[PDB]
Amino acid sequence: MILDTDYITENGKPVIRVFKKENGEFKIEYDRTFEPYFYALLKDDSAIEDVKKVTAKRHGTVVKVKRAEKVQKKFLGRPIEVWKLYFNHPQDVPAIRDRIRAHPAVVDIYEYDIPFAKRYLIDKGLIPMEGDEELTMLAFAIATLYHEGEEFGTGPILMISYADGSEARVITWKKIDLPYVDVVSTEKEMIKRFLRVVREKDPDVLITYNGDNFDFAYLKKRCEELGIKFTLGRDGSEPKIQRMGDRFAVEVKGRIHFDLYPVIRRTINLPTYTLEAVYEAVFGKPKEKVYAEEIAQAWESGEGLERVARYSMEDAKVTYELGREFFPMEAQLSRLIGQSLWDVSRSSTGNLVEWFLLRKAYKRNELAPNKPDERELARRRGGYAGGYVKEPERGLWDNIVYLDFRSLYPSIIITHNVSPDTLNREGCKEYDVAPEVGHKFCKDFPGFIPSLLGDLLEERQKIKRKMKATVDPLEKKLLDYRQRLIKILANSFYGYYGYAKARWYCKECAESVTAWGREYIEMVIRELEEKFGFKVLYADTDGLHATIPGADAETVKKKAKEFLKYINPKLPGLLELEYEGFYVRGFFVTKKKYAVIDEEGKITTRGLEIVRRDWSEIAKETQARVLEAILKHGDVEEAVRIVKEVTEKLSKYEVPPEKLVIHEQITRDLRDYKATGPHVAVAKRLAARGVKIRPGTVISYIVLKGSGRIGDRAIPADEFDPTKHRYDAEYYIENQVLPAVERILKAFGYRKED
DNA sequence: GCGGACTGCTTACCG
DNA sequence: GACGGTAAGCAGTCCG
Ligand SMILES: [Ca+2]
Ligand SMILES: [Ca+2]
Ligand SMILES: [Ca+2]
Ligand SMILES: [Ca+2]
Ligand SMILES: [Ca+2]
């Protein structure tokens, strides 16, 4: 299985490296054959040799075009003949391009911004992580003596924990007398040992939880300060800390550095992303957190380093268990997209789509359109109409049937051949015209994107069939990950059209998708209301809730099933409506906010404060208990009482602190903010202490007693101590518990609760 | 003047 | 880190 690709420079010539593992042995295949290239559309082929003599200096010396060949290749379907300009070293590409482009003979420079290592994987048609081979993995974690506002790295590492299938152990230089602790003599000697342990085990994968930003960077700062050759690589390389986007990312050449944080963040939706939370979330089993204040006084005292140790050991043990559960699906991802597990792990669905197209485009002889310049993105800053959301018939309704379209936007993208290479073509035999946008899509050639979208959905059914046949539970799991991933990639294509920084951007494509969406949703609703006697209670894009007021639950079911038989033949192409659920009773509050309870008794909650992370857990609990009473039981008085007891408990100061924590994410650099919410006021005072309040950072806080602006009275949950502080018993009753509860119980017009 | 009515910023959800 | 549509709360500024 091809792990990843890289290139070194042997005697001033770029030699490619394909890191593979064949028959339970890591092998490195070199390739000097592959020469870099980039395309160029000259105004007149006559000016080939004239424009071929452009140059500019690199670090070593001057760079000039090695050779050039005029090539025929399709662009948005339309045939085009352009010059591909070969260069000796890939780092000559970024030097020559700007000047070669400015040349008043060439029209534009194309396909110049693809890395060579990634170019090789595409052009050769080599698929990463293909074939059956069990890869050895080692999870590791570090514990540091980082002070309050201490310059990053000055604090020394106290312990290094590593864990795999066999064992979990701690290496440290203070004396923790336990069977899983290895006492070294100095910090230097423990790092020396850790590096040796990694060398001895020689694992294919190194698992971390946010190792990209903290763990690896910190080990470097120390290895510099102490003077240790930080060689974790298989080729004897020190780990490469690249500045990928807002954050950084770290590559251990020869191994897979699998940072769980970015993957877990993308996958799971949690209030906070502590390794304690991620564990308790995924596995359900709890994990205690030995703090920095504790880890410090432990080291300073010597008393009770056994807890500080157990923590470090459990951190690695958990990291391993999380890694072994997440890695497999992130591997099948690598296969589907066709780039390394490393990239696919740290990539947006936005870029995963573009990588998947760049690959298919090469195979189709399609020249890839360039990413937009700064002036272009400004021109793509024009929004478009979304989908229909019906203003809901409010109240408690009985016997609701949920109907929705199966893969709506994809069905449209396929059916109407929606693609930039088909948008308003010249003299096609057949066209499909968008309802209100008016955009006409050529229906002669199967479009680039639709063609691929078909194959994906076409393969997903092949995989779901092979799953039925699969006897091995492991393969049936790995097969489910593939089929599942295909779907999520298939539903990303509408979004990619609207995404400005996308190569294959198309505003009129995205506009037309939503438009057809609006028409078909509205047309279904109209029929179910007219032809059949249903009353559409609420509807969002692609889905609706309805019932037959006064009819029995059985009748609602039968009649809804009868409607699907009627409507589907009337609908065109792949546009098909499906019966998705029936619910005993349901409650619609506002647009995007409602709840329903199924026949078995499982309540389903959408949009209400219960699900939101930026509400006090007392408000989210108090609501869920009121909502349970109204739906599950039916005791409206019980809800009235549930509010009052909870309300009195807070005013008596008997409400636990833990339940009062409010979580609000920091969107941008705190300076850029135009108006200060509490979370901003919390973030700005925390940053004044030299803390790292950066984009992605979730701010926890509690409202302290008093009056005025809520933001000037917010002490972080960690910072908060009971003392004589207490809490703003008013706020949590006035602004949190009551408003949220009121939303549900307002249907029966309740005024005030004690 | 004062304080109730408006309005823009920001967050997190829904599909 | 895709998309647009939506409900809110909090902290400012009108204007009768
Ligand atoms: Ca020009
Ligand atoms: Ca539903
Ligand atoms: Ca099904
Ligand atoms: Ca019941
Ligand atoms: Ca948006």
Numbering used by the authors: 1 to 754
Q: What does the published report state?
A:
The DNA with incorporated dAMP is translocated back to the original state, and a divalent ion (Ca2+:1) is near the phosphodiester bond.
In this work, we demonstrate these properties using a 9°N DNA polymerase. We further used structural analyses to examine the incorporation of 3′-NL into DNA.
